[PDB]
Paper text:
DNA interstrand crosslinks (ICLs) are toxic lesions that block DNA replication and transcription, and are detected and repaired by the Fanconi anaemia pathway. The FANCD2–FANCI (D2–I) complex is key to Fanconi anaemia DNA repair as it binds dsDNA and is required for recruitment of nucleases that excise crosslinks. Here, using single-molecule imaging, we show that D2–I is a sliding clamp that binds to and diffuses on double-stranded DNA. Notably, sliding D2–I stalls on encountering single-stranded–double-stranded (ss–ds) DNA junctions, structures that are generated when replication forks stall at DNA lesions.
To visualize the interaction with an ss–dsDNA junction, we used a DNA with a 29 bp ds region flanked by 30 nt and 40 nt ssDNA overhangs (ss–dsDNA). We determined a cryo-EM reconstruction of D2–I bound to this DNA at 3.6 Å resolution. The complex of D2–I with ss–dsDNA was also in a closed configuration, clamped on DNA. However, in contrast to the structure with fully dsDNA, the ds region of the ss–dsDNA is very well defined, with clearly visible major and minor grooves. This suggests that the ss–dsDNA junction occupies a preferred binding position on D2–I with a specific base register. We propose that this represents a stalled D2–I complex. Like the dsDNA, the ds region of the ss–dsDNA first makes direct contact with the basic C-arch of FANCI. There are several contacts within this region, but one loop in FANCI (residues 793–798) seems to play a principal role in stabilizing the position of the DNA duplex by approaching the minor groove. The well-defined density for the dsDNA region then extends straight into the base of the clamp and ends by contacting a lysine- and arginine-rich (KR) helix in the N-terminal domain of FANCD2 (residues 397–412). Overall, our structure of stalled D2–I shows that FANCI binds to dsDNA through its C-arch, but the FANCD2 KR helix specifically recognizes the ss–dsDNA junction by means of direct interactions with the DNA.
Residue numbers in the entry:
A (entry chain A): 247 to 312, 349 to 394, 399 to 492
B (entry chain B): 957 to 1106, 1121 to 1167, 1169 to 1179, 1187 to 1226, 1241 to 1298
C (entry chain B): 384 to 396, 415 to 553
D (entry chain A): 1231 to 1398
DNA sequence: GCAGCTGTCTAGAGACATCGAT
DNA sequence: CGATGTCTCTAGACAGCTGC
């Protein structure tokens, strides 16, 4: 309620800083149904240079636990923090081992793009992001499949056809994984994309 | 409306230097550059005004810098939608070379004066950066024309060869200028790297030979490359003199005044290399016009080491 | 045509300004003469304005104003889907809200439901103690008073 | 020979590049340890360039152009940062290394000129980058001299064009 | 007789080359 | 990818070269 009131109230820098470090200190300690309001506040109410590491603190807070779609909307409400998220995962994947939350939020920012795909290509050439984690993600968190978002992720294979063909195989694997869950209309759209692939282009994607 | 503003300028400009009130001159010059925008193309008043600012440029000798810069922009913002500005740029380059010294400081340029605005002071980066600014613009659209060139094709090649022939006469008379140190030297070296990238037109015509194109290379070989290398033999000593005035690290001022020189060398050879391809393919030897490439070495004077 | 325009506003962000002009022109033409797709065009432009504040987005409001002044009944035909847009008081209500209200003025006047939604959203916005929220509230107040006319 | 020449230049350039990069006088007793290496390296380079003079075969020139350019670029990128600081510690030996380098790389301009004279399409393709790199070396030497306040001790002069082991 | 006038030095601000990797 | 330093400059100042 204090953070909700401060959301309602105006902002002053000196107090905002100390209360926001206090918030970051007290985000993960509470139950998963309680911190989302805090995350929404720090998203649509707070914007600063230090957010580039505050969001990394949030990532560490949410690393363990990973219906709970309010966080997605909170990230939708503002876009500058999403660019900060891209900047943070530019180095978060450089040290941390590509946690599932990283690829989830990467899909979210790519949905809400050019910088995301540039980062994806760079880490394709860098560390290839072991895809068992995203297999588990599509196994458990398939409620946000909505093929229009991963469609660009798949068609990135075309730009990844110049070299490193293994990542094309990983993209094929993850489209195989995403097909066998639900969303029969999305399944037929995936089959339409696949027949497009066998029709246009050379024999490789065929 | 401009005529009453014209009367104010001619009276104000003709006034003595003690009554120049430069703030007035800048605004009135800019006020014409804004009002002259909406003069229609199909009017005679376009011409007598255009010939008036030319004749006011030929006669008046103004020593202010922003005044000269502002007035020239008007002339080049209007002689850009009526004709080819390269005729004006050549004349400006004719004056700059005449006004300043010579690249070889051995042969004396005739003391001509195509414009009275350019004096011993105004030939500074004040004008020499505007001329190279306009020259860059002309080269920029020529790239588009070369892009378009790559029954209407014959007409396109007529203008490009004619303009580049005039444009080469601009740089030939401008690279021979004894430019002062600073950014004006740096602009010329980079702009010379632009005009050579002459390569794309040669590269396109590999698909084909015409006599007009051969004359251009004849012009290019006899007007740009031998003169261009003379500039490099001069920029090495003007920067040595300019480098003595340090605290009177230095690494910034040694890897910044010399960086254009390697790039200019590369542009010359790349243009030179694509002539090899055309000379063999087009069964015509077009290299008797030009001369051999010249390089430079050094020897650290250990005698004067300390 | 409508897909081309949608991705035109997408690809905008001067040739970019010319692209905006061309996209606004084609969208207005395809809205004016095509009857059964004008609702789709309105839905597309309503879905495209949101989450767009970093780039100059005045094109959205201006072409929306043009298409509603050419055809104001489209929003009611779309069952007045502008009510959801009232949340824009937190993204960038410096000028977008003013222009949006300017555009939707006749449809707020004719339609009582959208007027009631506007008055309630502004009433809950005014006492929000945020500087941005209060700015949005006072901006909306600047327009709502003249939305209704009784002087003569 | 050309196979030997190709592999020898490639290995020499790779070994030269493998040397650790520039350092801002981080350690004593290393700025002279890491100079005899480049002394013997430029010795080997000069030897190979001399071996060019006896075999003017076209593949030999094609190998030499490219790999001399690559070795010069690697030298400029790596050894010269060491030279900046090492000039104060050691004065004549670095100068001798520079004399050897000028002795070797001076022939590469002659090879470029010979390639241009005969209009060899497949061999002139490497001339511009090598010439640019040689000019870059010429001026990076000025930069190094500036690192130790030696600006009247430099003199960039015109190089007389020569044929392969010949003249003009 | 130390009162007058005469100018390079310094801070303003705006445009460019490479500035240094995203 | 583009924040940054470098540079033509226009003026102002108080301080050296006129003076006094």
């Amino acid at each position: 309620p204090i953070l909700d009131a401060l959301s309602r109230l105006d902002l002053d820098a000196e107090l905002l800083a100390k209360v926001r470090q206090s918030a970051m200190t007290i985000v993960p300690s509470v139950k998963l149904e309680d911190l989302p309001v805090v995350i929404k506040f720090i998203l649509h109410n707070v914007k600063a240079a230090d957010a580039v590491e505050v969001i990394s603190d949030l990532r560490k807070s949410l690393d363990l636990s990973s219906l709970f779609d309010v966080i997605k909307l909170a990230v939708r409400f503002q876009k500058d923090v999403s660019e900060a998220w891209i900047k943070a995962i530019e180095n978060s994947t450089s040290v941390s081992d590509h946690k599932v939350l990283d690829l989830i939020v990467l899909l979210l920012i790519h949905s809400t793009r050019k910088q995301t795909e540039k980062v994806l290509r760079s880490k394709i050439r860098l560390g290839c992001m072991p895809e068992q984690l995203m297999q588990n993600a599509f196994q458990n968190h398939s409620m946000v499949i909505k093929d229009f978002f991963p469609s660009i992720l798949s068609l990135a294979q075309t730009f990844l056809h110049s070299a490193h063909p293994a990542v094309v195989s990983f993209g094929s694997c993850m489209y195989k994984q995403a097909f066998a869950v639900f969303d029969s209309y999305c399944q037929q759209e995936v089959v339409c994309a696949l027949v497009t692939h066998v029709c246009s282009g050379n024999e490789t994607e065929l | 409306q401009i005529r009453q503003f014209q009367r104010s300028l001619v009276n104000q400009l003709s006034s003595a230097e003690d009554d120049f009130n430069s703030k007035e001159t800048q605004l009135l010059i800019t006020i014409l550059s804004t009002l002259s925008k909406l003069l229609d193309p199909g009017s005679q008043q376009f011409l007598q005004f255009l010939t008036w600012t030319v004749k006011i440029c030929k006669e008046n000798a103004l020593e202010d810098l922003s005044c000269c810069k502002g007035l020239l922009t008007l002339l080049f913002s209007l002689h850009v939608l009526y004709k080819s500005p390269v005729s004006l740029l050549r004349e400006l380059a004719q004056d700059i070379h005449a006004c300043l010294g010579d690249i070889d400081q051995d042969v004396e340029i005739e003391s001509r004066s195509h414009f009275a605005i350019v004096n011993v002071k105004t030939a500074a980066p004040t004008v020499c950066l505007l001329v190279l600014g306009q020259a860059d613009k002309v080269l920029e659209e020529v790239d588009w024309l070369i892009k378009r060139l790559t029954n209407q094709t014959q007409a396109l090649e007529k203008g490009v060869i004619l303009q580049l022939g005039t444009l080469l006469t601009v740089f030939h008379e401008l690279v021979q200028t004894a430019l002062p140190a600073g950014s004006c030297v740096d602009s010329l070296l980079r702009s010379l790297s632009k005009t050579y990238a002459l390569t794309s037109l040669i590269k396109h015509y590999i698909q084909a030979v015409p006599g007009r194109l051969e004359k251009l290379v004849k012009l290019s070989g006899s007007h740009l490359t031998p003169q261009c290398y003379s500039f490099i033999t001069y920029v090495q000593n003007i920067h040595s003199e300019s480098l003595s005035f340090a605290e009177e690290t230095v690494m910034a001022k040694v890897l910044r005044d010399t960086k254009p020189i390697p790039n200019l060398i590369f542009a010359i050879e790349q243009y030179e290399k694509f002539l090899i391809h055309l000379s063999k393919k087009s069964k015509v030897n077009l290299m008797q016009y030009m001369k051999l490439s010249t390089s430079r070495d050094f020897r650290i004077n250990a005698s004067m080491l300390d | 045509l409508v897909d081309l325009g949608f991705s035109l506003m997408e690809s905008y962000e001067m040739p970019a300004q010319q692209a905006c002009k061309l996209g606004a022109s084609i969208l207005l033409e395809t809205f004016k003469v095509h009857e059964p797709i004008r609702s789709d065009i309105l839905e597309q432009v309503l879905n495209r304005v949101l989450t767009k504040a970093a780039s100059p987005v005045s094109h959205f409001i201006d072409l929306l104003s043009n298409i509603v002044v050419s055809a104001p009944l489209v929003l009611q035909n779309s069952s007045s889907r502008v009510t959801e847009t009232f949340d824009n008081l937190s993204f960038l209500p410096i000028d977008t809200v003013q222009g949006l209200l300017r555009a939707v003025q006749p449809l707020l006047k004719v339609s009582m439901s959208v007027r009631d939604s506007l008055i309630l959203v502004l009433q809950k916005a005014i006492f929000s103690r945020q500087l941005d929220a209060r700015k949005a509230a006072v901006a909306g107040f600047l327009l709502l008073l003249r939305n209704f006319k009784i002087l003569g | 020979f050309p196979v030997f020449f190709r592999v020898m230049m490639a290995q020499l350039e790779s070994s030269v590049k493998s040397i650790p990069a520039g350092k801002p006088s981080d350690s004593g007793e290393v700025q002279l340890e890491k100079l005899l290496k480049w002394n013997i390296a430029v010795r080997n380079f000069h030897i190979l360039i001399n071996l060019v003079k006896v075999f003017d075969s076209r593949p030999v020139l094609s190998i030499c152009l490219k790999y001399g350019r690559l070795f010069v670029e690697a030298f400029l990128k790596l050894a010269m940062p060491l030279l900046d600081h090492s000039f104060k510690k050691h004065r004549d030996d670095v100068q001798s290394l520079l004399k050897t380098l000028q002795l070797s790389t001076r022939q590469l301009h002659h090879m470029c000129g010979h390639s241009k004279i005969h209009q060899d399409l497949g061999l002139t393709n490497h001339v511009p980058l090598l010439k640019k790199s040689l000019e870059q070396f010429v001026y990076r030497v000025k930069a190094m001299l500036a690192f130790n306040h030696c600006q009247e001790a430099f003199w960039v002069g015109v190089l007389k064009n020569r044929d392969l082991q010949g003249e003009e």
